[PDB]
């Protein structure tokens, strides 16, 4: 759900109208088309109307991408890596994710074997 | 058709003054335009597109 | 709960009556369908009404994403590690985390017995 920079079109309210002339029909169709089929390309350019209201000083159209402000205030990775290991840890099975180390052994008849072979044995 | 008439019919007026009666029409386009825009122009029909 | 980045619809308070005209209902239907089934996709797009009221030069209608301006006072993971790791120094099992080293044996009858081996003794 992460919607941060997708194209966003802004039309005066008359243009949203079902009665509307034939012309501003032709208009929401190539809007919505260019909302579809929009993508980065060679060719990617826009011709867009602009005016500014002379009471506003605010452009009527627009053509933005959506901005979003603060971060999310917890880092997921750390703490999934964190309940990884704790898993792994109730198990005494951490050879899955550190390798074979060679100060360990699978033989119960050799004086080097691991916590996972001595609970097999029992 | 016809308030769009009107608004062109309104703005176009101005003050005037013969002996005894004096009209002044210098305000009336203010208001009227303030009352247009937002109950006509304001009112959206339609859906918006995601 | 962690809710930045949602987003959220702004619309007058006219439009969210009971009594309204169709064409406002429906218009409240199909934001409320947006707001359900909008995800990012290669389609993601918006086409949205804009008027900017001239007597308050702010936007009547708005789309946005909620945002937040402070961060988190205190790391979580750094204290749930440190609170940890004190568990583990209670028990002197620490082999748990930190690996069978080739320093420390499990053998009562080596030189090198662990903590841990020496407490199974008693």
Redesign the interface.
């Known amino acids: 759900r992460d919607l941060v920079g997708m194209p966003k079109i802004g039309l005066p ?2 243009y ?5 002339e034939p012309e501003k029909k032709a208009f ?1 169709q190539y ?2 088309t260019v ?1 579809n089929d929009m993508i980065a390309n060679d060719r990617a350019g826009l011709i867009w109307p602009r005016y500014i209201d002379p009471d506003t000083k605010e452009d009527i159209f627009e053509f933005s991408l959506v901005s979003r402000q603060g971060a999310k205030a917890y880092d997921t990775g750390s703490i999934i890596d964190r309940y990884s290991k704790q898993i792994m840890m109730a198990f005494m099975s951490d050879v899955l994710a550190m390798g074979q180390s060679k100060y360990g052994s699978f033989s119960l008849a050799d004086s080097k074997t691991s916590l996972l072979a001595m609970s097999v044995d029992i | 058709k016809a308030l769009k008439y009107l608004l062109f019919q309104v703005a176009k007026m101005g003050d005037e003054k013969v002996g005894g009666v004096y009209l002044r029409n210098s305000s009336r386009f203010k208001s009227l335009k ?1 009352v247009y ?1 937002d109950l006509v ?10």
């Open positions: 309210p008359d949203l109208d079902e009665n509307a929401v809007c919505k909302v | 303030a825009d122009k304001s009112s959206v029909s339609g859906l918006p597109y995601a």
